[PDB]
Amino acid sequence: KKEYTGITYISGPLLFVENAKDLAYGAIVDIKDGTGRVRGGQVIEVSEEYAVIQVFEETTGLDLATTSVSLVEDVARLGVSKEMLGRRFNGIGKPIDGLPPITPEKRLPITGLPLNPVARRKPEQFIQTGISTIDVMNTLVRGQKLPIFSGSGLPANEIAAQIARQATVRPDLSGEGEKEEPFAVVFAAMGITQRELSYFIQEFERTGALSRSVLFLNKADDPTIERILTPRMALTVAEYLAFEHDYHVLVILTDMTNYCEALREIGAAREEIPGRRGYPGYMYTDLATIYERAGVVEGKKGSVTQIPILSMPDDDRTHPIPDLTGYITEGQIQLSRELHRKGIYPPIDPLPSLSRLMNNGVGKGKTREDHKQVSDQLYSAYANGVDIRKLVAIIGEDALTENDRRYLQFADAFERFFINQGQQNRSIEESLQIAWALLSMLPQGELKRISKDHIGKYYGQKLEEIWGAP
Amino acid sequence: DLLKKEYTGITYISGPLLFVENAKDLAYGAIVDIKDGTGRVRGGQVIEVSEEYAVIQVFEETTGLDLATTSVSLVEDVARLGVSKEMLGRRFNGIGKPIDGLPPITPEKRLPITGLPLNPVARRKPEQFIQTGISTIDVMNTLVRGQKLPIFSGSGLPANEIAAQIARQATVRPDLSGEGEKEEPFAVVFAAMGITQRELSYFIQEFERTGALSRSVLFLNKADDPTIERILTPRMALTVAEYLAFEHDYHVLVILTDMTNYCEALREIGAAREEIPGRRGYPGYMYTDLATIYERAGVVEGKKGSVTQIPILSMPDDDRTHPIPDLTGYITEGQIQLSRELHRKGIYPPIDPLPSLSRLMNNGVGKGKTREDHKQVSDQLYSAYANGVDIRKLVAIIGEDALTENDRRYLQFADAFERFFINQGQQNRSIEESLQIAWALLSMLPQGELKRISKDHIGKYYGQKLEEIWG
Amino acid sequence: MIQGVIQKIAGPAVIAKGMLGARMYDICKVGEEGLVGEIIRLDGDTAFVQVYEDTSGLKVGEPVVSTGLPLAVELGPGMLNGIYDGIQRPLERIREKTGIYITRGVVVHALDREKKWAWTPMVKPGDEVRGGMVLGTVPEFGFTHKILVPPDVRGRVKEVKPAGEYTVEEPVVVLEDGTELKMYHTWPVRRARPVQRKLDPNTPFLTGMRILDVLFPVAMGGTAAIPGPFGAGKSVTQQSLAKWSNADVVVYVGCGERGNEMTDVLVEFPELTDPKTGGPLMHRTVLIANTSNMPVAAREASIYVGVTIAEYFRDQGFSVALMADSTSRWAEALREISSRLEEMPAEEGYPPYLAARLAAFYERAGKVITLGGEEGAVTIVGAVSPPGGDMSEPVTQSTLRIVGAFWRLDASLAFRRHFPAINWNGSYSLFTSALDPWYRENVAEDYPELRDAISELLQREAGLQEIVQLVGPDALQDAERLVIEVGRIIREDFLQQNAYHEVDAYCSMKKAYGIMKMILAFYKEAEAAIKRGVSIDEILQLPVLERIGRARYVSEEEFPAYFEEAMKEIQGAFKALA
Amino acid sequence: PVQRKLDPNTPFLTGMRILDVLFPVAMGGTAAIPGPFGAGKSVTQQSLAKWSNADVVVYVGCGERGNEMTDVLVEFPELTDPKTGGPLMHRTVLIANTSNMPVAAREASIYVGVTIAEYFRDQGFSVALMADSTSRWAEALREISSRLEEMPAEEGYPPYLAARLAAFYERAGKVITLGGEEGAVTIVGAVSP
Amino acid sequence: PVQRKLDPNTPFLTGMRILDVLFPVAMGGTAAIPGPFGAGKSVTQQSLAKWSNADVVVYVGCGERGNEMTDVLVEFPELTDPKTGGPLMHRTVLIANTSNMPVAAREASIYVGVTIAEYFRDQGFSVALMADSTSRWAEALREISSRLEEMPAEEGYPPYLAARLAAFYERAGKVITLGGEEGAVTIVGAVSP
Amino acid sequence: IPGIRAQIRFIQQVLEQREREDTFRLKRIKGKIEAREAEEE
Ligand SMILES: Nc1ncnc2c1ncn2[C@@H]1O[C@H](COP(=O)(O)OP(=O)(O)OP(=O)(O)O)[C@@H](O)[C@H]1O
Ligand SMILES: Nc1ncnc2c1ncn2[C@@H]1O[C@H](COP(=O)(O)OP(=O)(O)OP(=O)(O)O)[C@@H](O)[C@H]1O
Ligand SMILES: [Mg+2]
């Protein structure tokens, strides 16, 4: 509409524009250069003497004599529709799959509002990821924030894709339940490479998971502001679906380390003194505004669950990103490099993994009655087994008592058959069957953490039930 | 060119910096005279120019400078040093003025002190083995002609003595190489940056004893001397060295005594200028500045001269991670790192071979250059010494009683190595003697453990005992 | 054109007034010497210029003219077997004009304008043309250099020249609209050269090194990083990649490193042989040398020039390896310029845009279908130089999040003169899974499992080393001692490799597979013997161990017989004991 | 304001033998509990609410997670006051803040709570103030300090952290109000490193 | 100024066996004695001033306790010179700028002490200079640089601290005086890390 | 164990000091640019 031509300064990602008191704070703008190319930017400061734009992409051809700025939107908004399902976007919402743009049912500000604490309720139902080490030992409950802590070379992307393809709700295990309870997956990728992008496209296309998922893929060579916006748009769509059409949305945020690095870069671009370890002083609040857009609301059948996937910078849990994420979220699924190098996939180490909500989503009327005790027994037995494995390298197998040898074999079998499930989709019943088969190796009476009735009903099954078709 | 333009109108004097406003005709990098009221003339260099004012870094103390009677005048647009072959035998100070009382020298050329990059196409690959007479350098850390091989010293370690000994003993081996047998010596350029009187006295006395002051040029910036003059001293020295080498076919050996002092001067200027620092307050451009000095060494296709650098720097707290050693090692072509542990045991030269390195070693050793077994012998010595150090660490936690026979052989090898290869005192060891000692020591190990030495070499040199050399 | 004068000179930074209308990242000519520079900030009428040469002597008031166009590279025949500066100036020509030193303000054409090239047209009148299509061919050092339309040029062909001998300045083809197409075109360096589509990496980049090509492989369209402290062997590893890699062309970018390395390549590579075509190895190589004592602003330009040249050779259907000698020096140059710009730093002085620049550089790699429809690739292998060896620097951390393979070098191993000196625990690859089919087809149907077995053994060793440090090797049982000993065998006889040898400097995939099979067979035999009660001390003396350890130095041609004999001898050395 | 502060010569009957015997707190005293996962901090705090001899209970969650906050906001209505058998919430004020609420509110939470506790103390009552995760409050303080561009001390916290903590805690104590009656505020804070 | 500098070839006898035997110092040499508080820096320097073989001693207390200067003044007048046999004070010059005296006076104290020592050297004596705390001089430099708003090097000290220390220590040495006589200044410098 | 604890505490203290110095420098330079804009624009 109205063009601004008083560009007085360009340096790095910033251009100053004069006589622009009509540009709101945080408004999205278009920048036209002498060649007619249109860039995009965001208002980062408005004063009576000039406004400050932050330019997405580079500022190569821009000159102070043939540059014009026009307003696009006073508030960054996203056009959401139920037609978004089966579509891939680019972190600011533009399609990148070649399909026609969608007709929105409404446009929503990406910066959602905080949920009212008194409108929340307790998470009480589980999501079946299909992975034994999560389903049994670190269960996922709708409305939870359960991040995946990984490393540099570990296969976090493959696990993300597997959970994306396998995640389902189980309405039949909760009493009679309702057969039809819609389920969607929102997959938000930040700063990924081209090979990872191709992998994700192929994984979603091959198994048909695309039909029930919305993808927001931001590349590492894409602008950083788009990276910052991507999770907000993902959660905007998730909130829309869950709290306007009673979907059960599972959100996967692929690399929160990339998001945090982009946040620090953007902060340094606006001349902000960094906080601890060079990250912004408000990283806690920003991460919270992302992670707290999940939960269950009273009177609404929908829910939002989050799986933020972050890479431990130097395999260091004391780092800001994972420490703050631990403050905000509820537990963590820890990938182990020893298992990965030993050849085990998915390499989830149960010992440092914790699901803080597992109790409320496990038990009678949701899963089976023997779930909590089986998880506790698996944990204790695996810990004992690893201890014996370390000791036998110095004292020898003969020196160990018979129960210790039982623990050794149990730990080996646990790693080989429970943790290492390849790409198979294990229902909760299959996982519990494997767990009882593994526990059958230990003698009755060493199962100190399982009630007598449960042992009687489920103990004894031989490993041949699953060993035949692992 | 022939006239004197004088700039009154100085607006600022703080620390090492001076601001003069209307000096729009001063070139960037130009050299100026600052004349105070009493008539004393002081130097300085322009490091920033604009229509507003010019920033001048002063080369002396600012005592007595006032904003009313002080003036700035131009000497030249580009800092050049008068260079003559007759500089040999002369002693100059940090800014290159004589301090021996003899008259100023008559230049043949006036070359810029910054110099210019050497074209990679013009460079020649350094391949001439230089025999230093020190076994750790000669056998395991070979120095070639046209190399930058610094010494990483400590607060009280004897790096100066090692440098004096290397200068005293250095020679090529024409007999072993097959080229023309000539006995031309080295021309030694000596740049002291912030040297104490004790160290300078030692160096001067040693050179006078060896009769090398005749073929040496000295650029001396002492500890009481101004700190900002140290920026120019290495550049003047390298200008002279490059001139001699690539215009008069000299083989020049350059010694830069304390690069830590140079880096401190750089930090002082950069802090005055509000430069964004790197690690520990040193300017972000310190790597480039150090490369402008170190990379002025090598050999050039179609010329018979060379430049060899032996910088000496003191690691502040025996810390190799400190910026100065770190950047130097990223720039230079190896390093000889002294050890305080060996110094305490009395070993001289106290050179620890594991952290030491010589990049160009493979170009100056082998068949036709020193001897065919050289490289494999050095590799095996490193392997055995590393095994010995590891076994010492193992004993520190388990005790000697648990050591197997092979482990004790390796410990004995490590101790004998330290006492008979590293420790040599003031003795000129030919490469042949050093190889013989290395072989006598490796004979302490079973034949089969020498996996890095070819079978034929083992047959030709293994077996001799250490008693055949001493006792 | 846009003309102004100098206001301010502070190091490589020049502020020019009277430049209203100048565009960002435009090339400008500072002073009377026409020093090339780049506009990095516009402020009022002023313009901030980073000068790609030295600035000593420049005064205030000297002219400043903007070319109006950004940094560009001349692409066409005449590049292989050449060495260029950061902004693509032939250094041989500079030596011919200047002396042994590089003087500032030399204007020399990137491509030889007098050399005559044989032209075989591939197009005839009336043929449609699109950017990237092939207009003809021109032989160059045993390559068939393909003449390509500029990527943003279309039309129909008016008249093609007859086959003959012409120069690169002559309009080999002219279209209907009047566009005069020559053997060379120019391209902005900061713009990724367009491609038709990217392809999933599914073939290996053979480097000749066992550890890299076996445990930490990199695909043809892949990216790798090799960080380490000084004295660990980054330069030796990268030179070995240049010598022994299976790429078609090699672009070696010496960004702010020693000039002796460039000299070494120039002097030595003409005496070597190309692995595939068999000719001199400099015929498939391009050198971009911007040493440490050269202008700092040109360190950035070197990376872009190298990547653009690599993309050009990729568009010609070739496979190219790009070797960036030091990205850390590029980052340091960015920090210097940012200090001149008086900006807010981030982390340890680095500007906020360093990671975006690094990602934009590394994302220019990959295997593609060219606009002309061929298949070419670019593999980037960058080196990082952390201060103090610390891997927590922003540059190294940024690289970690973008590369598919991380070849972490170690000070402990290099100190022991153990090379390649790669830290196995802290290194990883991401191309292993995708390369299994190729290994099954072209190496051995069980190569993946043998590689995984060695990974298992090394991880078992790493686990047991904790107890080894706690209590010492003798305290362990016999099976654990065997794990330790086989670990040492793998370290010394398989991972160790000598680059100055005439045989071991290069290792084929089948040779690595044979050595791995020998080691695995020996481990199985020795474990069985321990189960049957043989004393571990007696296993270490079996003579077969010397053969396993010397297998490295066996010639490639002789290897199969040696390996068959070694397997026979391994079976025998325990069969006799029974 | 208050007329006088009195010495701590009376116990705060938490109802729990371990606390009320081994490590007792006086009326108008101050206490601290760490929160480790699985330690029963929730049950202990609810038991302080149910069985303490305080007439009013002010509960402040300064920066809790959304799910912990909903747990506390769903449990407290369900509790029963033992003294009367009526809902416990009829003598409780709950201040609820989540991690995604404005940092200003999260800083002001404890002050609002302590002022309300002082008000009920001035009405002549004995009030128990339970501040959950004063560490999250310190985080809010640190963020606010960073926004002011202040020089930190220690692990990035502002150098006045101890001053603010003292100002909050020293508002506890047994007193004679300006009305001449006797009332107290007892503070039990939680630290979650 | 001096005519020429000489090579130290005579011991500086301190009277302390460890220093005089294992770690000697020559008559014109320089020594640093760092140590934490309570180690014996001040006692060592007092013993050096009491028993050393210097003709004159110049003791410089920079930013240190006043009880030490009082101890020197009360005690030395009743102690004998090792060589001349007279009272100890007659060979001692005391420069006192205690800890609570003006901070910027510490620099002046160091320079004044070294200049007086140089003077007595020029009279042909052997002079020992004891700097009680060079760390306090560094602190004074740091404060004055903070008031100048200079960009600091490590730990806030100005980037010229090493140069100033070097200039001060380089005034030590055995020399031929402008009058032709032989003199020396031996500087022992205490550091308080 | 206590020795390694002491070493860890020392290293952590040194790193915190370096961070504090960096923050002080950043504040100085940001104030410099702000004052430049405010006074001489
Ligand atoms: N006084 C008690 N009597 C009986 N059972 C108790 C008591 N205190 C705790 N428990 C049991 O122990 C569990 C303590 O672990 P839980 O996870 O519930 O703690 P929490 O208080 O919610 O922890 P946090 O506040 O750190 O999140 C309680 O859930 C209950 O099962
Ligand atoms: N040689 C000594 N003989 C006897 N006592 C000694 C000796 N050296 C030190 N002490 C004891 O140590 C106490 C502290 O020594 P001193 O005053 O010299 O400390 P300092 O190292 O100078 O420390 P500070 O920095 O606190 O002044 C002396 O009061 C005396 O009690
Ligand atoms: Mg004292």
Author numbering:
A (entry chain D): 5 to 474
B (entry chain F): 2 to 472
C (entry chain A): 1 to 578
D (entry chain B), E (entry chain C): 194 to 386
F (entry chain G): 169 to 209
Text of the article:
In structures reconstituted from 30 K particles, ATP molecules were identified in the catalytic sites on both ABopen and ABsemi, and sulfate was confirmed in the catalytic site on ABclosed. V2ATP is an intermediate structure formed immediately after ATP binding to Vsemi1ATP, since the catalytic site on ABopen of Vsemi1ATP is immediately occupied by ATP under saturating ATP conditions. Similarly, V2ATP is in the state immediately after ATP binding to the catalytic site on ABopen in Vsemi1ATP (middle). The catalytic sites on ABopen in both V1ATP and V2ATP are filled with ATP because ATP binding to ABopen is not a rate-limiting step. Two maps of V2ATP and V3ATP showed an apparent density for ATP binding to each catalytic site on ABsemi when contoured at 7σ (standard deviation). The atomic displacement (B) factor of ATP binding to ABsemi in the V2ATP and V3ATP was in the range of 30 to 59 and 41 to 77 Å2, respectively, although Vsemi1ATP showed a higher B factor range of 112 to 133 Å2. V2ATP disappeared in the resulting dataset from the reaction solution after 30 s, while V1ATP was still identified, indicating that V2ATP is a short-lived intermediate compared to V1ATP. This observation implies that ATPase activity lagged because of a delayed transition from V1ATP to V2ATP via Vsemi1ATP in the initial reaction.
